Amino acid sequence: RQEFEV
Amino acid sequence: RQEFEV
Amino acid sequence: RQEFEV
Amino acid sequence: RQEFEV
Amino acid sequence: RQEFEV
Amino acid sequence: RQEFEV
């Protein structure tokens, strides 16, 4: 899965 | 912390 | 995973 | 401390 | 990992 | 102390 976070 | 996974 | 932090 | 991983 | 600090 | 690692 693709994921992004800060 | 920033992170990214494809 | 790619990650960045300060 | 700043860090980066690809 | 790449890192920098003062 | 300043430090750097690649």
Which one of F2, F5, F6 has the shortest CB-CB distance to E6? F2
Q: Any CB–CB contact under 8 A between E6 and chain D?
A: no
Which residues are registered as beta bridge partners of C4? Answer: B2, D4
| Residue that is written with structure tokens 């890192």 in the block | E3
Cα–Cα distance measured from residue E5 to residue A4, given in angstroms and rounded to the nearest whole number: 25
Q: How was this structure determined?
A: X-ray
Query: Amino acid letter at F5?
Result: E
Cα–Cα distance measured from residue B3 to residue E6, given in angstroms and rounded to the nearest whole number: 23
Cα–Cα distance measured from residue D5 to residue B3, given in angstroms and rounded to the nearest whole number: 9
3-state percent helix, strand, coil for chain D, nearest multiple of 5: 0, 65, 35
Burial of B6 per CB tally in 10 Å (0-12, 13-18, 19+)? exposed
